[PDB]
Ligand binder design. Structure first.
Ligand SMILES: [Cl-]
Lengths: 102, 102
């Protein structure tokens, strides 16, 4: 298709998180492309920008379209990840939008 | 390559921006896409996320690798783009990261 839907979730976590937290997140990340439809990209990692503003990590994702991102809401890997990460997240900021493919 | 460098700049603009501001943005961006190398994606658009935190627009971009993003930072047409937009930007936050290629 000529476009895709980008969804980027920037996050600042509690200071208590450990390597274990990230190990479990990565396990949810792994389930995601297996389990959700229309997912082109799905990654969780460290923010290396200078002007990160305290947001140290992000989930970055691209879907074939906004409807695939809508369905991702009940993707069980995602419902589960959200429930897992939620209590440890201090702040988030999100960018969603349609962008050219590639 | 297996990975690409993602670069997302979220922005809120000043209340007093002029009527054709976004068209001028698009002009600088177009000139920049003509002149600067190693871009896999570059889009300036509206942020449609509910959790936008008031960051109404973003630039989203992907480069072949970190070196290509490094060359873009110093691309004269990119520098010009920043000189125009900077004074109209009220708030900015940035995500950079290496992510799986699409
Ligand atoms: Cl203006």
């Amino acid at each position: 298709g000529m476009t895709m839907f980008l969804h980027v979730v920037m996050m600042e976590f509690d200071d208590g998180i450990d390597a274990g937290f990230f190990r479990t997140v990565d396990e949810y990340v792994a389930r995601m492309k297996r389990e959700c439809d229309g997912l082109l990209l799905y990654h969780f990692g460290e923010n290396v920008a200078a002007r990160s503003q305290g947001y140290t990590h992000a989930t970055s994702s691209a879907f074939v379209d906004a409807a695939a991102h809508d369905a991702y809401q009940v993707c069980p890997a995602h419902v589960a990840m959200k429930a897992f990460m939620g209590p440890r997240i201090k702040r988030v900021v999100v960018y969603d939008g349609e962008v050219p493919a590639i």
